[PDB]
Write a protein that binds this ligand. Structure first.
Ligand SMILES: COc1cc2c3c(cc(C(=O)O)n3CCCOCc3nn(C)cc3-c3c(Cl)ccc4c(CCCOc5cc(C)c(Cl)c(C)c5)c5n(c34)[C@H](C)CN2C5=O)c1OC
Ligand SMILES: OC[C@H]1O[C@H](O[C@H]2[C@H](O)[C@@H](O)[C@@H](O)O[C@@H]2CO)[C@H](O)[C@@H](O)[C@@H]1O
Length: 512
């Protein structure tokens, strides 16, 4: 073991009410004598997978639900089994946000959506459209002010505009990605044109936009409920309202459900359950957090009935209903990373909107595309017959890549039979547990050195060799897990190289 028994360590983002959470933890300690430590480390959503994979990390992690599926896919989250009485206290759709493969993998805390925050002393009537913001910025520049400033370094904040005219992440399946259609292009182009016409600055981040709004220098910002507290201390006469439309269409923020997941490696799962169910998700626990930094529309019905009277919460829910609940599928991280880079590169001029979004599309589709190819190859190699299913969207790439792989990988498997048999014997794979064990070994062997298509063909060809072995020892059910694991090792460790090669299209070109 590694996580200490007898206490609770919690991770929550630095923009949330961690002091109020610590107050709840101090009440928990007063009752039980169990010390609760709340930390807010930088990049905790990226740090948690790494440290939890090795059995460390916090007992409880707080984040929006979109990441948790990935954590659940990697075995890092304990299953949540609250009884009906407690489940009935929270809104069903918040439970739906934290369900993964039919299992509850977190407690939902609160519903978050971005709104347009505006300075009533500068803008008694905020703009209803994105399109009128350039003229409004000219009017405000005439008097020493600016129209709008918001964080351009995180794609969460730009996504409402990208999605307004038809951009989307995953259609409601990981095969259909819409970050590079005409609507996404139109939204990102509007943002880039705002920057080129000096209505916004490409370097603007969270701190810069927050400081400019709370000092009264800019008339609008885009942000979530957690920010209201600081504005309250600013004494700016502010309102919270619906996001402007773009091309006559509502802005569509990605809706997050702040949720608390229990580390699968924690020896304090019953303590964490008691704390979350009977201390935090109460009227007084949620209030203690909310008084620090507002949570949004909390999942607890009794408290949300009080919070819903707040016009700021009504606007939050109006924008949420115009938006969409985030998926929790494990590729969300990759998606976000891709879009993050796109927005930044588009805003700085390092790429055009077309180039940036094409790269984002490649990055977002990489997992499913690689998985389709590798799975089909491994299954047809192990059984001697091919999958009859249609290739689907971007199916030309998958078909062509599978043909290329058939050629090159049967060459590799013929030539490298001795080393392959040796490593297969040295690994000794017998069941589903050893295949789940294979991933750290795979990362080690696939590590350092050069990255080329031939090494990837070697990875996949040895995967096919192992799939053949699994078929022989009557373990066909292990082939699809194996394939998945291989995919995860490939797309994660070689993400940037793969995107630079245009992905499997570059694979196909290289061996043409
Ligand atoms: C140190 O840096 C490296 C290492 C490697 C390189 C290159 C460049 C190329 C290339 O140009 O093709 N290769 C592949 C050469 C194939 O060598 C055959 C070879 N011999 N022995 C003595 C053992 C091997 C050997 C074997 Cl049996 C099987 C797979 C590999 C791989 C793929 C990564 C790991 O996969 C998987 C691993 C596991 C546990 C599982 Cl369950 C699955 C499902 C997949 C590599 N290997 C392999 C050798 C070490 C070279 N290797 C590799 O990645 C490189 O850069 C300078
Ligand atoms: O920008 C990508 C980022 O978006 C969302 O993160 C939000 C988070 O949900 C909010 O609670 C608040 O903290 O702002 C974050 C943006 O900086 C996704 O939840 C996250 O996974 C993703 O990386």
């Amino acid at each position: 073991g590694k996580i200490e028994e007898g206490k609770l360590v919690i991770w929550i983002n630095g923009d949330k009410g961690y002091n109020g959470l610590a107050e709840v933890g101090k009440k928990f300690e007063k009752d039980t004598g169990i010390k609760v430590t709340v930390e807010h480390p930088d990049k905790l959503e990226e740090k948690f997978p790494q440290v939890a994979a090795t059995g460390d990390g916090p007992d409880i992690i707080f984040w929006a639900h979109d990441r948790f599926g990935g954590y659940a896919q990697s075995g890092l989250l304990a299953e949540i089994t609250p009884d009906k009485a407690f489940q009935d206290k929270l809104y069903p759709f918040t439970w739906d946000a934290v369900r993964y493969n039919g299992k509850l993998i977190a407690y939902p805390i609160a519903v978050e959506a971005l709104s347009l925050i505006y300075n009533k002393d500068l803008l008694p009537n905020p703009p209803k459209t994105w399109e009128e913001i350039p003229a409004l910025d000219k009017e405000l520049k005439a008097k020493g002010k600016s129209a709008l400033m918001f964080n351009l370094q995180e794609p969460y904040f730009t996504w409402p505009l990208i999605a307004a005219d038809g951009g989307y992440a995953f259609k409601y399946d990981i095969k259909d990605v819409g970050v590079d259609n005409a609507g996404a292009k139109a939204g990102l182009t509007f943002l880039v044109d705002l920057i080129k016409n000096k209505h916004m600055n490409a370097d603007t981040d969270y701190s810069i936009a927050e400081a400019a709004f709370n000092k009264g220098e800019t008339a609008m910002t885009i942000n979530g409920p957690w920010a209201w507290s600081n504005i309250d201390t600013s004494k700016v006469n502010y309102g919270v309202t619906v996001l402007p439309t773009f091309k006559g269409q509502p802005s569509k923020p990605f809706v997050g459900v702040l949720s608390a997941g229990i580390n699968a490696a924690s020896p304090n799962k019953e303590l964490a359950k008691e704390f979350l169910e009977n201390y935090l998700l109460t009227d007084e626990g949620l209030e203690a957090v909310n008084k620090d930094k507002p949570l949004g529309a909390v999942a607890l019905k009794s408290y949300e009935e009080e919070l819903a009277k707040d016009p700021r919460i009504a606007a939050t829910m109006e924008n949420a209903q115009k938006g969409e609940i985030m998926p929790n599928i494990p590729q969300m991280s990759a998606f976000w990373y891709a879009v993050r880079t796109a927005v930044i590169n588009a805003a700085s001029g390092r790429q055009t909107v077309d180039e940036a979004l094409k790269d984002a599309q490649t990055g977002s589709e990489l997992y499913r595309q690689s998985l389709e190819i590798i799975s089909r190859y491994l299954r047809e190699q192990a059984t001697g017959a091919k999958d009859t299913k249609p290739m689907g969207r971007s199916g030309a790439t998958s078909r062509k890549a599978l043909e290329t792989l058939r050629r090159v990988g049967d060459g590799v498997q013929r030539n490298h039979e001795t080393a392959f048999q040796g490593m297969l014997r040295k690994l000794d794979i017998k069941n589903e547990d050893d295949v789940k064990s294979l991933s750290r070994v795979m990362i080690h062997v696939f590590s350092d050195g050069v990255t080329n298509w031939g090494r990837i063909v070697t990875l996949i060809s040895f995967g096919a060799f192992v799939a053949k072995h699994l078929k022989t020892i009557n373990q066909e059910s292990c082939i699809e897990p194996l394939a998945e694991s291989i995919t995860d090792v490939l797309v994660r460790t070689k993400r940037d190289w793969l995107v630079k090669q245009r992905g499997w299209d570059g694979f196909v070109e290289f061996f043409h």
